């Protein structure tokens, strides 16, 4: 060794290519590993040289040392990790490749590495390199990152800072090389669990890109994509150009894999939230029928049934094709099972959702007869009363069930036939006393159904007998706009 090391002239660049090849021999590589100065000579050199054949080689050696435990440790303790990182700057693709593969080694096995990479800027650099074109290279890099980001939030915030979400989202959108799409999907998912990073990932096109890969053959990917999309699915109610994603999901509902059927269902429930296009997209690719079919095929499995009903709940209201969707549910035999889900062993969350869906289906007049003829009413009341005591005297506040069941009855009360049942289960004395409730949301619905019930003379009498003019009128100046309006309508309807 001796001579080699020393030199500060045209002399040492010659010395350079000279050691890269002893690194190849086993007891030679092993040899230099047991030297303190042999390593720190490559290091100082590799960074402070400017001959593109001197670097390529010094880097090359380190890569060869990085396979063994005393190989790695000697590298690390030789302050090489600061160096290896500046080499991530080198234009020479032969060095980029030496460095990023090396570091990967370092992070995977060596102790105190992740810190050193971070502290030296590693992250902000590794994120800059995602514009490179070599897939074999990216997939390694997007791993180093996943390594540095796992269970470390400072790091995930710095990859947000750098424009990572864009970079990675571009990859998902450009390449098809699995090992890459995979390691890159893993990172996305890891950042998918951050307050901030979520919207970023979304706005960059995260949703639309992940879903090019749902019908992929590799399952170790379609997973990641599904899960990841599920996380983000609540940030993503704002986006456009989903036509693709929606239509795909609506087809994975057919998947004879329970754990993919739930994710398909979960994710839709969210992307159908509030966004009036997403609803229409979903309806036209036959989504109503797909959901119903999925609900029947799921039975007592409430991880599937809960989401799917929320989704049907969403699609049955507040968009141009909702009347379509309310009929669709009737025509594809959804009514009988929707109702049967108000029965045990359904749990309240699910029962909460299902009443909401029934509230909506009831707006469609065709669904008045059909819903009546499945005893949706007698059952809604059952729950209403059970619930209106669990309060007077969880998993969900019973107030929500009381409001839910009276709203649903409100809507159903529109049909004169229904109106007759409703009254004849001795409900009226119970509607009137809901007025006196601390919750306005409850007073609003209560007064609503009364208003409808009270379009019949004999009922207006019945409703007046309960002394309903006492609190309708003290609500007549209620803080709540909806509360106060209905009060007028019932009072107006008993005087005619």
């Amino acid at each position: 060794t001796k001579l080699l090391n020393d030199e500060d002239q045209v002399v040492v660049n010659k010395a350079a290519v000279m050691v890269h090849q002893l690194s190849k021999k086993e007891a030679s590589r092993h040899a230099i590993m047991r030297s303190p100065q042999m390593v720190s000579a490559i290091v100082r050199t590799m960074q402070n040289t400017n001959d593109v054949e001197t670097a390529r080689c010094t880097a090359g050696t380190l890569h060869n040392l990085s396979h063994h435990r005393e190989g790695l440790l000697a590298i690390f303790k030789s302050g090489g990790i600061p160096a290896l990182v500046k080499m991530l700057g080198s234009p020479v693709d032969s060095v980029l490749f030496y460095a990023i593969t090396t570091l990967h080694n370092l992070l995977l096995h060596q102790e105190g590495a992740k810190m050193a990479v971070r502290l030296a800027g590693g992250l902000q650099k590794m994120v800059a390199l995602l514009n490179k074109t070599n897939v074999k290279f990216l997939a390694i890099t997007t791993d180093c990152l996943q390594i540095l980001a796992y269970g470390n939030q400072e790091s995930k915030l710095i990859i947000l800072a750098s424009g990572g979400p864009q970079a990675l989202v571009n990859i998902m959108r450009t390449y098809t090389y699995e090992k890459l799409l995979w390691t890159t999907s893993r990172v996305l998912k890891v950042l998918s669990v951050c307050s901030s990073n979520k919207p970023a990932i979304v706005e960059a096109g995260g949703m639309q890109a992940l879903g090019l890969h749902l019908t992929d053959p590799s399952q170790r990917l379609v997973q990641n994509c599904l899960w990841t999309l599920r996380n983000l699915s609540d940030a993503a109610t704002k986006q456009e150009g989903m036509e693709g994603l929606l239509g795909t999901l609506v087809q994975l509902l057919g998947s004879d894999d329970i754990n993919v059927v739930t994710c398909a269902a979960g994710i839709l429930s969210n992307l159908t939230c509030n966004n009036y296009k997403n609803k229409m997209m979903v309806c036209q690719v036959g989504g109503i029928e797909a959901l119903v079919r999925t609900v029947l095929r799921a039975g007592d499995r409430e991880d599937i049934t809960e989401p799917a009903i929320c989704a049907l709940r969403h699609l049955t209201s507040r968009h141009q094709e909702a009347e379509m969707a309310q009929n669709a549910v009737r025509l594809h035999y959804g009514l009988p099972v929707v109702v049967k889900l108000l029965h045990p062993p359904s749990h309240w969350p699910l029962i909460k959702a299902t009443v909401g869906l029934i509230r909506n289906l009831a707006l469609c007049p065709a669904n008045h007869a059909p819903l009546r003829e499945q005893g949706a009413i007698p059952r809604l009341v059952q729950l209403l009363v059970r619930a209106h005591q669990d309060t007077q005297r969880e998993g969900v506040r019973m107030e929500e069930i009381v409001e839910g069941c009276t709203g649903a009855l409100h809507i159903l009360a529109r049909d004169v036939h229904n109106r007759i049942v409703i009254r004849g289960l001795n409900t009226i004395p119970l509607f009137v006393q809901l007025l006196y409730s601390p919750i306005e949301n409850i007073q609003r619905v209560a007064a609503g159904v009364l208003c409808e019930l009270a379009q019949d003379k004999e009922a207006a009498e019945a409703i007046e007998a309960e002394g309903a003019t006492a609190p309708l009128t003290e609500l007549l100046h209620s803080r709540n706009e909806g509360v106060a309006t209905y009060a007028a309508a019932v009072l107006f309807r008993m005087s005619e």
């Binding site: 890569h63 791993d143 599920r230 109610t237 979960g266 429930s269 969210n270 939230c273 709940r313 507040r318």
Partner: peptide, 28 residues
């Protein structure tokens, strides 16, 4: 339609050897 057009929908909140060596020959 419905009284309640301004209503919101509730959202559920949810929560390489082969290529490394291959790359140092495309380096050599």
């Amino acid at each position: 339609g419905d009284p309640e057009l301004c209503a919101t929908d509730e959202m559920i909140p949810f929560k390489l050897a082969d290529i490394k060596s291959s790359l140092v020959n495309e380096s050599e």
